[PDB]
Symmetry: D2
Subunit: 436 residues, 4 copies
């Protein structure tokens, strides 16, 4: 009580009853569970990204606008079905729906485009159709590749080579769908940007009753590595034909978030189902509840202890900033990033504070949706003559978008993370600012 008494008197008892704060402050995991409250409403913005598969049920520009408003962050194109012409039209429709909100830069929501490959099938490695589809992705500017049936590190090197010199910036998320992928997980994760727990094929390749062990192990190892992990397949399966999900389905979504997943995915629920927008809304609602129920007290202690000592200033600043944010219940951590890396290093410590990432890179703004709790703001202004003033303008842009989206209020504390010189790789400063 004395460790939260003055902040309780200051912020009020109502503040400490919302977002499962009594449960988050508990001394044991048992007490944390006992303190979970259905009347404790979530306050924070939803941090787990939603990946929606695009298909006949979610292809129209008007339908895509509704899905963006419902919470879709990443659009998945399943190259197991449809022609290149079909997928190019899907891409164009997504971009048209996304840019329809670009008129207001302080509220614009970027949406990443991910290409899910067909896979090797009976083959030993990269198929000829995969090579053509990967070149299509580079030519159409996709942000992410979900590489199907990755079984070893050489499979991801083949995908990287097929993307060529122009696709160096594309993120490769390896799909683990069989026993070999699970057994060679460490070598696959080392060369990948992230992982997808593809439970559909995984549940056929290994006994169905063992999939939860593979999911929890891979999420844990991705969290340890600080790399994005996606939980996928049959999350809200019954919503393909019904307006409401089963009790097992809502539980599954909540548990993927509690496990530590950065992203949650919808496949047939959005691609061919009768309720694509409702499926996105349901994942949004469950993820907000589940994020507030995360036991940050032990989680942060374990992430901190597991993370090795580092002499990289971005790594050092990131842990100092997350520690500072927890100390004052900071509403947000505003970070300036070029590639998204500084925001990713903040995200790996699982702060409760939203990580508002201000970037000039449209691709980085789309790709940071892979990292839990990163809210990208695309800055379109031309540079100031004085670099320090250009930095300050970018920080104020983050505060003003934060106030105009509800993340920040006057009186809040914010943590600002910047670097000492222009260019990527020099983040080294953490500032505590009071919102006026």
């Amino acid at each position: 009580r004395a460790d939260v008494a003055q902040l309780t008197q200051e912020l009020g008892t109502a503040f400490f009853q919302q977002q499962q704060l009594p449960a988050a402050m508990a001394d044991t995991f048992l007490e944390h569970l006992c303190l979970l409250d259905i009347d404790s409403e979530p306050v924070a913005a939803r941090s787990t990204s939603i990946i929606a598969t695009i298909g006949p049920a979610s292809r129209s520009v008007e339908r895509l606008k509704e899905m963006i408003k419902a919470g879709m962050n990443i659009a998945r194109l399943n190259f197991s079905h449809g022609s290149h012409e079909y997928h190019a039209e899907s891409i164009a429709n997504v971009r048209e729906a996304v840019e329809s909100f670009a008129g207001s830069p302080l509220s614009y929501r970027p949406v990443a485009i991910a290409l899910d490959t067909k896979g090797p099938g009976s083959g030993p490695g990269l198929s000829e159709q995969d090579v053509r589809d990967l070149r299509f992705g580079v030519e159409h500017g996709v942000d992410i590749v979900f590489a199907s049936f990755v079984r070893k590190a050489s499979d991801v090197a083949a995908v990287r080579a097929a993307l060529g010199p122009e696709g160096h910036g594309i993120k490769i998320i390896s799909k683990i769908e069989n026993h070999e992928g699970v057994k060679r997980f460490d070598e696959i994760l080392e060369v990948s940007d992230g992982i997808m727990v593809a439970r559909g094929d995984l549940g056929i390749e290994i006994p169905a009753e063992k999939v939860f062990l593979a999911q929890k192990m891979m999420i844990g190892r991705c969290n340890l590595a600080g790399k994005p992990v996606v939980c996928a397949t049959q999350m809200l399966e019954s919503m393909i034909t019904k307006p409401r999900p089963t009790r097992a389905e809502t539980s599954d979504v909540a548990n993927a978030v509690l496990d530590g997943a950065d992203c949650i995915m919808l496949s047939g629920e959005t691609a061919k189902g009768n309720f694509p927008v409702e499926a996105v809304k349901m994942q949004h609602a469950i993820a907000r509840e589940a994020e507030a129920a995360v036991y940050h007290r032990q989680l942060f202690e374990e992430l901190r202890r597991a993370a090795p000592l580092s002499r990289d200033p971005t790594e050092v600043t990131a842990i100092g900033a997350v520690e500072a944010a927890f100390k004052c219940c900071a509403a947000a951590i505003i970070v300036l990033t070029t590639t998204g890396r500084s925001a990713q290093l903040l995200s790996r410590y699982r702060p409760r504070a939203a990580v508002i990432a201000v970037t000039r890179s449209a691709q980085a703004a789309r790709q940071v949706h892979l990292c839990r709790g990163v809210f990208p703001l695309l800055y379109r202004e031309p540079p100031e003559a004085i670099w320090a003033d250009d930095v300050d303008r970018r920080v104020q842009f983050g505060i003003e978008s934060g106030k105009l989206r509800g993340f920040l209020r006057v009186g809040d504390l914010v943590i600002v993370v910047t670097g000492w010189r222009p260019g990527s790789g020099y983040t080294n400063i953490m500032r505590v600012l009071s919102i006026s």
Copy 2:
């Protein structure tokens, strides 16, 4: 041996942090322990035949649920008789006989404020037919439990009352309901309609946590393997749901339509059995036991003191089992609350207690049918040997294993006070 320490997620169970525990989970680490989470199967047209009920007992059904929201007293009496006929068909081999509890799930109050007149008639039927458990529908306050207890009368004092929490008021008045109940059921079907669907997981995790703290049984119910009503395999969300209910701390998992009216009732029981075994091995006992020990209050009750000493002793030697002699099941329940990895083999002469201890995770009841020996200490030893011989036949024990034996200083309930380290010969 090295092989012993690679099975049943033992590297993951020994980890120093929960993060390291998750990272060490292995799909190739096979479960060795017997399945400790009980399976409740609802009886209906798909699972009423004596031959079908025998298959479900072999698949792992521990409790048969009679849903009094459907069917007449005549229908439920035939269900009871069919269950008992299927259960007693294995009584010829006492070392392998599996007791099966009968639970009566009430229709509920409906629009009424308290106990309905149909519920009073159904509760009397249950007492007259010897049901072991009552799943009391829509419990909203402690007085609802007292009304059910009064309707059971003096002859139904031994029946367990498991309160179903199905609405916001039941969640808010949870502590007072749990205090007077024998346990709880998280009735997710109605709960998901009474409260927002996206909040049911918080109510489930909270109630399971509080029941685990109280040392009282908690059942997770509804739509666990819903798709298996028409399909032979469940969805990825359904297997995850069953595994997570076990990881949350549920003592029992339930099947409703999957066994009452579906096309795969035996397969639905086999699937819950398979998932529960995997999930139990993935329990992080290192932190779990530490938290249960610290949360449990100090006690001057010798059964309570012997139970914690026995669970501590079982962890120290990796005991294959804790064999406990019990009359009412209470000594086995107090062992179960500390969540030992060792199976709790409960030897009893009470057929009702043998059925009712299925409510407690990790309790394997053995019904002893021999008449008492003239010398009490010899009668005690004969029962303990019956526990060892059943354990060996069923695969729980092998020669060379260490077992913890929990007994009392005199006959009669309430006198457990002895813990003994035994080597299996």
Copy 3:
């Protein structure tokens, strides 16, 4: 049941704290110690403490082990010291409330590369005079212990060898020395000359920690109350030193010149007694027991498994004592290694074991001399009641208290496998 006053004594609020910081903040000078003093006091016998009348006063003040320093005096001088100690100890044989066994320890002169000629003759003298313990001076390697062990001839293998670590080599070869020794003495006098004085506290804390991990006795020695050789009261550094040796985990604390040649030998014993009682109540059992439990390897030895189960049971009910039947002292030692807050009352038929168990913190020996009963279970019950009645007589127990009883399944050393919860009647 116990009252608010019970939970305010013996630093119980501080012992229940969730963190070590909160434990320190809750220490209270008004919280009085209730438990009997568990850290044994070793007093060096010399001109100031040799008379039978003076030795009776030191026994009453709390002396448990009499140390004979073979660096000074002849065999004839030490034989008279032994006879005077035995005469003073046996002067209380008539009164059960006052009779306490007192061990006799021989501290060797020391080495030369290995065992000196005088040490061989002195060790032979110790065997001939029935000493219980040998404090082997300047042990540097495992072969030094083996030489002392071999010098204990055909008749002295039951004597305990406590190795004195007095130099850099002994500290560096600590693990191999501890493995072959019965215990260790942190001989700070010579150690403080052999290594920099400012590093002695590191060596003391390390050796005490490793001895606690191994479950072997550790003695903290030299200059603990040095100023009391000439002054009636010690310095603030001296009382702090005694308290910190107990808090570190020392089984025994020692007095050298303070008792052998000083002006206040009895007052020095009284002061160590007073400080040790306060320091024992201030032990942070919550984290201590958790760490001892986790550090101790898994065991298939039933004595080791019973001991942890019994200490866990004692903590659960705030047992007034753990009564253990032991012939060699081993069962009492395995209880002592988990640092229970309850007194370990060790009932033995062995006078040697009764004297030697003073090396283990919290062990209160009772020598039992009744003729054996024909029925073994009757003999066991009689020794258990002897422990309860002596406990009642000495203030450890009252009617209504709970005790933990540790016994085995058959006669003979090595079969402890039973833990019972008993109510004092």
Copy 4:
């Protein structure tokens, strides 16, 4: 080699038992001694030449015991201390500030005595930094001392001496209004049973550590060194245990005031404190300090925990902080970082007073000002870095954490920076 020094295997242990088992007599201390030494000035330590030797041996605070001697005697003691301290001012990168503390006579049979009022006024007139207020029993005793210091003595630190049962019982109210505490074991050991003093010491140190306020352990720490060249085994153990308990300062009374080995007593406390600081179990300590410290919306408090967390993440050689009053350095010190807290200040009084906080190394900035505030700030940072390099705290390639504010004036610390040396 780096990970074998300063008990680093023992500091990384998963349990306190394993931490103890891993303590190594061959693991040498590398960090600068963080626990300050308070030496009592008397006949054996009054000469300017003797005081220079004590400053070199490690004396950080000079204590004037007003229970003995006249105002004329103490004024000469003050002048001799200042002369010895300023004899090293020729080299600003290595100059060591020394605080002057006035220990009052006390109330005796009486609240605040008339002699105490005259002595407190003497202290203000002679510019003392700290007052060790004898026999404090309640919060009103502290208020009386504060009032006696008047308007000219607002900046003086009041360290309350707890010497009796009432002071122990009313501890929380006394600590709330005091700047810190002294565990005055001499009188405490006569007022309460001697066997209970260790409980009072450990409780008060724990509560001061929780409050983030300085605590001094005092009396008979190396008593035998008044006549002997080496201390007893109990005395070295006592000093080590006071440091391990969490004391910010350790004190010498008769050992330096009247003993035959005043310089050797200071050297012995220095040697023991260095060893004891390396044996601190930071893994559990930092976790507990972090959890115990309340949530805060004060940017200095928030920056302090972020900086200590960052220092542990990279094994930073130092945390360089700019402070006017010493407060920013005190808030870093409360989290017990292994990294030295190099406090760069212009205030000569703050530089002397921060010796009360464990691990704070004051540097008195006497370099010319920069016209641009930002350039002035960077220059004070470079000053900390050069003084750290000269004194052995830092080497090229080391990482430091730099703690500054957004605008001039005290109370605005809000920035933490990760900097690579040279």
